[PDB]
């Protein structure tokens, strides 16, 4: 027997900036967004779902300096919370 399934579901995208806008990369330290994402994933993967972690990354960018960017979560069809449960 055949059954119907949603063609697009359980996606989450996370971009380094908002549409129209630049994203920054340090020549020796790497991309700011990437570095910030790793730090937040290391700290919060144990306790927070991926959506919440991405929000926290966004919050860390809130106060703009000379090189500002605002990471954007896009096209979300996660129907559940995605916890990484690191260690399991």
């Amino acid at each position: 027997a055949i059954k119907k399934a949603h063609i697009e579901k359980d996606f989450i995208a996370f971009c380094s900036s908002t549409p129209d806008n630049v994203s920054w990369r340090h020549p020796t330290m790497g991309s700011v967004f990437i570095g910030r994402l790793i730090e937040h994933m290391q700290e919060y993967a144990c306790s927070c779902d991926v959506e919440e972690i991405f929000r926290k990354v966004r919050f860390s960018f809130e106060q703009p300096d000379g090189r500002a960017q605002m990471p954007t979560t896009e096209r979300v069809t996660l129907t559940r919370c995605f916890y990484l449960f690191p260690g399991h």
């Binding site: 399934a5 995208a13 380094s16 806008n21 990369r25 990437i34 570095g35 916890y83 990484l84 449960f85």
Partner: protein, 168 residues
């Protein structure tokens, strides 16, 4: 300790996991085959060299491994090569015995999308985010049905600084 497979990622204890119906199911650690893909463009034909990209590759590769994913790293690809690589990734048999996936894209970017290695203003070489979703959806990747697909993109989305002035 950072000597383990999870490295610098803080561990979720058994008590914390029990504390956490509305959560994506996790497959058995002993048998699951988690896959991740990183595509990073550093050297281009007409756009400046992305210095520091290697730091990003190292960081994301190690992090995804820490989280339990087998990581494939592909470098300096055209949008066509990126499409071929994505199509191959969607066909991997390991997804069947996986509970989730991560896709990381790192390159120069414009409003329309992510720059391939051959990109120039005269002859665009762009991969759209829409194409990434399509190639990984239930139609083109049935093995990842009901499973979280996380897409991470480092790239400009235009030339604007993303700021406005205000007074106190």
């Amino acid at each position: 300790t950072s000597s383990g497979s999870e490295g610098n990622v803080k561990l979720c204890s058994l008590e914390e996991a029990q504390r956490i119906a509305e959560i994506y199911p996790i497959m058995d650690k002993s048998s699951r085959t988690r896959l991740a893909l990183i595509i990073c463009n550093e050297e281009f034909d007409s756009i400046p060299r992305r210095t520091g990209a290697e730091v990003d590759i190292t960081g994301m590769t190690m992090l995804l491994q820490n989280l339990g994913y087998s990581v494939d790293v592909k470098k300096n690809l055209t949008a066509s090569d990126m499409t071929t690589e994505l199509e191959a990734f969607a066909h991997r048999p390991e997804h069947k015995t996986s509970d989730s996936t991560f896709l990381v894209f790192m390159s120069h970017g414009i409003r329309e999308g992510i720059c391939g290695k051959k990109h120039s203003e005269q002859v665009p070489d762009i991969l759209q985010l829409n194409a990434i979703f399509n190639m990984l959806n239930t139609k083109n990747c049935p093995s990842l049905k009901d499973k979280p697909k996380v897409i991470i993109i480092q790239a400009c989305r235009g030339d604007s600084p993303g700021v406005v002035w205000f007074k106190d």
